[PDB]
Amino acid sequence: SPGIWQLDCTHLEGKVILVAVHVASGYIEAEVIPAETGQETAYFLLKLAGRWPVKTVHTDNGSNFTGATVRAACDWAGIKQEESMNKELKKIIGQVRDQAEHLKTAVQMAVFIHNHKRGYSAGERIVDIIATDI
Amino acid sequence: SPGIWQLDCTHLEGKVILVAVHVASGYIEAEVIPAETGQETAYFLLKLAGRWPVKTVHTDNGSNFTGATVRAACDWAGIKQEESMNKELKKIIGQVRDQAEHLKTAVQMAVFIHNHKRKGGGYSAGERIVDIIATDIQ
Ligand SMILES: Cn1nc(-c2ccc3c(c2)OCO3)cc1C(=O)O
Ligand SMILES: Cn1nc(-c2ccc3c(c2)OCO3)cc1C(=O)O
Numbered sequence A: 001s002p003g004i005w006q007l008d009c010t011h012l013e014g015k016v017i018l019v020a021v022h023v024a025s026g027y028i029e030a031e032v033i034p035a036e037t038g039q040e041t042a043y044f045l046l047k048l049a050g051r052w053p054v055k056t057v058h059t060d061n062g063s064n065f066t067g068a069t070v071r072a073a074c075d076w077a078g079i080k081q082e083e084s085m086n087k088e089l090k091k092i093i094g095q096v097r098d099q100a101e102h103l104k105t106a107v108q109m110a111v112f113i114h115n116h117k118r119g120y121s122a123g124e125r126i127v128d129i130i131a132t133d134i
Numbered sequence B: 001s002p003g004i005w006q007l008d009c010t011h012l013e014g015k016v017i018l019v020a021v022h023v024a025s026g027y028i029e030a031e032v033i034p035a036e037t038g039q040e041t042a043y044f045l046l047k048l049a050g051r052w053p054v055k056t057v058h059t060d061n062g063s064n065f066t067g068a069t070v071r072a073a074c075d076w077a078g079i080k081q082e083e084s085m086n087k088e089l090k091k092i093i094g095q096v097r098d099q100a101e102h103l104k105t106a107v108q109m110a111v112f113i114h115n116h117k118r119k120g121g122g123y124s125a126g127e128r129i130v131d132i133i134a135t136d137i138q
């Protein structure tokens, strides 16, 4: 449970956003990526796994997961494979879109808002969950 | 203490790496950025602050911190601006460099290895940051 994430893609302004949610806490990491390719997906998963203890990722099982680069990345990082945040995040992105030149900045502001919003925030919940596991 | 990070720049292969260390645990976040400019620095700080409780960042106070964009990002996120690892990290990057087509990939494998390495026993930096922050929460 504390090691379980769900990864989804969302599309805005021509670009692709990957959103990983830590299922037990609702905490999110999200990035705008150039294209929904195996190489970018692998890179996103490598970054996530270096930052938080990722044991299993639930994905949409689509084309960007079938290639050798993504497979090698999950294997290397030790990851196994196996929208109630999403409109909220879209909404937050809409709320802040005007204050940033670039979509990637608005996405990161929305991540900040989502994870900090508060009895506990998603940021407090993920730490409490993982600490409890340790 | 739990909210204190140090941010430094490292240069390799013509590119700039920013490395943020969480001072009490040794946990790191690091990225290769296109140039050491205020816009990229601000964006790096926004990202970091959305993921971990960042209260204060100790920097080198250089040119990329003096501009409007960085100051507005720190203000917005509620952040005040008040060699060892960085060589071990450089070494881990060298160790993995040939397995990565791109430097950015090697940097993130080095981040993974640094944060997960259990130096005996007996906690990793990743375990230590979570333990420190949860303690503070309670
Ligand atoms: C509500 N709140 N949430 C956080 C917060 C945000 C992100 C995190 C985290 C705590 O631990 C891991 O990642 C900080 C605050 C605060 O200082 O008020
Ligand atoms: C050594 N090790 N440390 C962790 C670990 C634990 C808690 C964390 C983290 C990494 O990053 C943020 O919070 C996971 C493992 C592992 O089982 O490989």
Ligand SMILES: [Cl-]
Pocket: A007, A008, A009, A036, A060, A062, A064
């Ligand atoms: Cl996807």
Ligand SMILES: [Cl-]
Pocket: B007, B008, B009, B036, B060, B062, B064
């Ligand atoms: Cl710097």
